[PDB]
Structure formats: structure tokens, C-alpha cells
Homo-oligomer: A and B are copies of this chain.
Amino acid sequence: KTLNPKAEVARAQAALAVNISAARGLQDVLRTNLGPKGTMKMLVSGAGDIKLTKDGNVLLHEMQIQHPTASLIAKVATAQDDITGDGTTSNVLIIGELLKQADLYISEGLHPRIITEGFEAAKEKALQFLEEVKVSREMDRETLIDVARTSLRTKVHAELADVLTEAVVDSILAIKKQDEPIDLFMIEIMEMKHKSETDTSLIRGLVLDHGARHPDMKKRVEDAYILTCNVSLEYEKTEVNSGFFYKSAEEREKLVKAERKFIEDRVKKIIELKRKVCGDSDKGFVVINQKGIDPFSLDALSKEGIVALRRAKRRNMERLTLACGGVALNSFDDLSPDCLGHAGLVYEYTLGEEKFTFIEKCNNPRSVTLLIKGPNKHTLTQIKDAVRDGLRAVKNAIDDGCVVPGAGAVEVAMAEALIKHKPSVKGRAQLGVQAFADALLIIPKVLAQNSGFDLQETLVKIQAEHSESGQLVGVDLNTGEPMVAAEVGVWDNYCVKKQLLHSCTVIATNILLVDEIMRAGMSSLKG
């Protein structure tokens, strides 16, 4: 204040109160999205774009809040989202509950170091319990189906959820190999604004966003070959600056006829290769080019019955090679017939102004394409986000050799273990262990509040049913009665929960140790 009069600095109590208020606000705001019985939010940008999503990360990024703690929470949520998959709202909920439980004991007159030590001990105990309670499975087709259904149940209704689950399972089984990790960047997500959303199916092949350009071309071929290349077929100029010099009109015409001979050689080579491969009027030939094609080459290809596609993406070079089985060559050196692909049905579709290209009927494809349909843009975005979340959950369940039951029995078991473990710890860490155990029980409280039942009575009944038994008694969302979680079909993940707990502990340790938010920067008010 004495050195910089235009600087705002806060002490320890003020900064702690501000952080606690921000955490409580972020917890109360993102609390109606936990569980499938939650509410749907509507976000409108500055340009007038309606977005109907249910993810916690998108809702936190599109909420218009300027705060350092809120920015850190948003960054942590984005990191969790793009590292694991599903676990954004629960992260903020547990962080806020832990901060509230810590402030409840700090305001009475305690030290943050003992609270941090107790939180670390409780996190270690919970990690040990989760590592000793996880059950091993073989992950068959029914397990992945149930996992995808449980992951997609909190997005749409029942029919769309099951359709997306089946589509994701089929795509994963199609892109499944015998070894090596599951490589992504293979399932193309194409959105079409026609028909309804109930007509979502999986296409065993690749769906392009552009079709042919020449009107005198074939539209439906029963049997054709796939040629993947990226050579240039346009009038390319030399690197060094050159110039033509003629004398009369005959020399000019000769130079014009001779300057278009480089692409003519490639056209003749392609024609000869097609005539050697096919021969009669029984098979077709599709040319997939990444660059543009001159109109002369297009007409020359259409004169023989060749459907060529120009201007393609770089990601389609690997998907076509993995699906059909061709060779993505760059030059026309060793043009062998074995470097081609096999097709089954090459037909296009017109949707007003845009054009599509569907490649179906394949032998053994390895990169499928999910077709998404929606009447609106927000619905398409929500379906795409749900499909991405389901794919991430399936990948996380496949990469791990264990399964964790959902509902809230794991949190109750962790709280019981922490309650049974606090008397074994010395010092003042018992209060921290109790706070960590009470903060972990916020998932069933929110799950029971959004359904329409009580909270304290439900928690008491769950604890009474779990203490007298030895099974994972979950929390039901239909009648409120305590039921089994690892018996109906509710599942979750292990690494995702571990990363969530680690991030929560790191955030709690970073917040409980910061008590000075000094701002001594340049205002930049010159001119």
C-alpha cells in the first residue's frame, strides 16, 4: 500500500473467506447435474447461439465468471475431462465440500498443516481401500454394454441412450485388435441435419463430406476399386521464374498443346492401370485425391467412367487404408494393381446444397464411422458429447483390468473405513480424518436430493444397512430404498476415481496453504 497505492492486497482471513465463498457458490451452482434425474441448462452466447448440454465442464466454461479460484477449478476440470473422461461436476462438488469441512474447523482455531496431514492420511487410506476392494473381471460384451448404458443414462432418455450404447459398443468391437492400446482418431463423427435423432446407426466404412463434381459421372457402383493418393493433378508451375516466347499463332498453339503434357502422362497411366485391372463393363474405379483436380483431368476421367474426389482431409488417408486395405502412394512410380482397395457399395447422397459419400460393404474394416442425425445444432452437439463421453468411458474400462460399482456404496465404505481408522492415528489428525470422511459422503446426499427424497434419513438408512451387512449397498433413484450397486448393473471406473481423488487432494492442499492474494501489476492506462 505504501509502495503501490493502486494495488489491492488482502490478508489471510479475508482471502480465506473469499475462497470459501467462491467454493460454496461453485458447489451450489453445479449441484443439479449429478445423476440422470438432473435438470438441463440452456446457454446463449453473445451472437445468439443456443446450446443445450448437460456436461459439467462445458457448463463451467460457459458460465461467465471472473475469479482466480474459479479459473483454477475450470482448468482442473478441463484437465480431468481431456485426460480421463467423465468426472467434472463431482470434482468441483468434492472440492467444495472439502473446503467447507476445512473452514468449519479452521474458524474454531486450528492449524492448516494438521488438516493437510489428516487429509493426506485419509486419501492414502481411501486409495488402499479402493485398491483392496476392486474386483477383477474379463470384460465381455455384456459388461461393456452395461458400462456404456450406465455412462449414457445421465445424458438423454432411454431409447437414445441404448442406441448410443449399442453404437459405441459396435464401433469399439470393430476397431478392436488383438494387442496394443486402442488407438483413437479413427471413428469419424459426421452430423447431418435431416430426419430425426432416433435414426442413429453405425456405418461400417467411411462417410465423406464431399462428393463428385462432374455431372457426367456414375452415382451408384456395385463394384469398384479404391485408390488412395495425394499427387497433384492441377497445372503446377516451376519453382524458377520462366517464360514462353513464340513467333506466330502456330507456335503459340503448339506451346499451349505441349504445356499440358505433364498431367496427361499421369492420366494415361491411370487409364492404362484401370483398363488392366478391370477391362470390361463390370467393375468400377474410385480415385481418392487429397489435392485439387483440373477440369480437363476431371473430364478425361469422366469420359471413361471414373469417379474422382478432390480436396480431402489428411486424416482420411489412414482411415481408408485401415478400412479397405489399399496403399496411400504419393508418386506414380511402381503402379502395381496390389496397391488398390476393395469396395462394395459407393453411392452419394444429396442434402440440398452439400454432398456426401457413403462407402459401405467392406471385407474386414478397422475404422468405422458413426452417423449422427439431429433436427437442431444443440441436439447434435449434445449427442456428439455424449458419444465422446461413452467412448472415453469404454476405453477407460477396457484399458483397466478391474471394475468399480457406481451408485454411492464406495463412498460409504470409504467413510466407514475412515471412521474406523481415525482412532489409530495420533495427534490432532482425527479432526481432519473426520472432515475428509464427512466430505466424501456428499455424492449420496446430492444423488438423493435431486431424486425427491430425504438426505439425513437416507444416509442413516444406508449406513445402517451397510454396517450390518458386507455388500456394496448402493443408493436407488426410483423408490429411495437401499439396494445393491454391484448386482443390478451400475458400474464406474477405478483410475478415473483415483485421478479425481488426487486432484481434489492437490486442490485442497494448494488452497489450505495460500492466504495472500496480492495484485501488484501494471494498469496500462497510458494515452
CB neighbours of A456 from chain B (8 A)? 108-109
**Cα of A129 to Cα of B523 in the assembled complex, Å:** 63
Closest to A428 in B: B456
Judged by a CB distance under 8 angstroms, whether A455 is at the interface is: yes
Query: Is residue A454 contacting chain B, with contact meaning CB distance below 8 A?
Result: yes
Q: Which residue of B lies closest to A431 (CB)?
A: B456
Nearest B residue to A21 via CB reads B21
Alpha-carbon distance A109/B449, docked complex (angstroms)? 8
The docked-state distance in angstroms from the alpha carbon of A141 to that of B198 is 94
Closest Cβ of chain B to A459, distance in Å, is 10
- Contact string, A443-459, partner B, CB cutoff 8 A, digits 1/0? 00100010000111000
Q: How far is the CA of A456 from the CA of B430 in the complex (A)?
A: 13
Chain A 106-117 interface 0/1 with B at a Cβ cutoff of 8 Å (1 = within): 001100000000
- By a CB distance below 8 angstroms, the chain B residues around A109 are 449, 454-456
* Copy count, this protein chain: 2
Instruction: Give chain B nearest CB distance to A480 CB in angstroms.
Output: 14
Nearest chain B CB to A207 CB, angstrom units: 49
**Which B residues are CB-close (under 8 A) to A108?**
445, 455-456
Interface residues of A in 413-467 (CB under 8 A from B): 445, 449, 454-456
- A 128-171 contacts with B by CB, 8 A: none
CA separation between A454 and B109, bound complex, in Å? 8
Closest to A458 in B: B109
A456 and B449 CA atoms in complex are apart in Å by: 34
Chain B residue, CB-CB nearest to A109: B455
**Once the chains are docked, how many angstroms separate the CA of A234 from the CA of B79?**
95
> How far, in angstroms, from A507 to B445 measured CA to CA in the complex?
31
* A289 and B456 alpha carbons, distance in the complex (Å): 77
Q: Which residue of B lies closest to A105 (CB)?
A: B456
Within the complex, the shortest CB–CB distance from A11 to chain B, in Å, comes to 13
Q: Please give, as numbers and ranges, the residues of chain B lying within 8 Å of A445 by CB-CB distance.
A: 108
Q: Which residues of chain B are within 8 angstroms of A455 by Cβ–Cβ distance? A: 108-109
A449 to B108, CA, bound (A): 10
A445–chain B nearest beta-carbon distance, Å? 8
Docked complex: A302-328 residues within 8 A CB-CB of B: none
Q: Mark A327-351, 1 if CB is under 8 A from B, else 0.
A: 0000000000000000000000000
A108 CA / B108 CA spacing, docked (Å): 21
In the complex, A109 Cα to B453 Cα: how many Å? Answer: 10
The docked-state distance in angstroms from the alpha carbon of A109 to that of B445 is 10
Can you list, as one digit per residue, whether each of A210-235 has a CB less than 8 Å from chain B (1) or not (0)?
00000000000000000000000000
CB-defined contacts of A454 to chain B, threshold 8 Å: 109
A109, A454, A455 — most chain B CB neighbours (10 Å)? A109
Bound CA–CA A454/B455 (angstroms): 35
How far apart are the CA atoms of A455 and B431 in the complex, in Å?
Answer: 14
Instruction: State A312–B454 Cα separation when bound (angstroms).
Output: 73
A454 to B111, CA, bound (A): 12
Whole-angstrom distance between the alpha carbons of A163 and B505 in the complex? 59
- A120 → B minimal CB distance (Å): 22
Task: Please measure, in the bound complex, the distance between the C-alpha atom of A108 and the C-alpha atom of B457, giving whole angstroms.
Answer: 11
- Kindly identify, within residues 168 to 198 of chain A, every residue whose CB is under 8 Å from any CB belonging to chain B: none
Question: What are the 4 closest A-B residue pairs judged by CB atoms, nearest first?
Answer: A109-B455, A108-B455, A109-B449, A109-B454
A-B contact pairs, 7 of them (CB 8 A): A108-B445, A108-B455, A108-B456, A109-B449, A109-B454, A109-B455, A109-B456
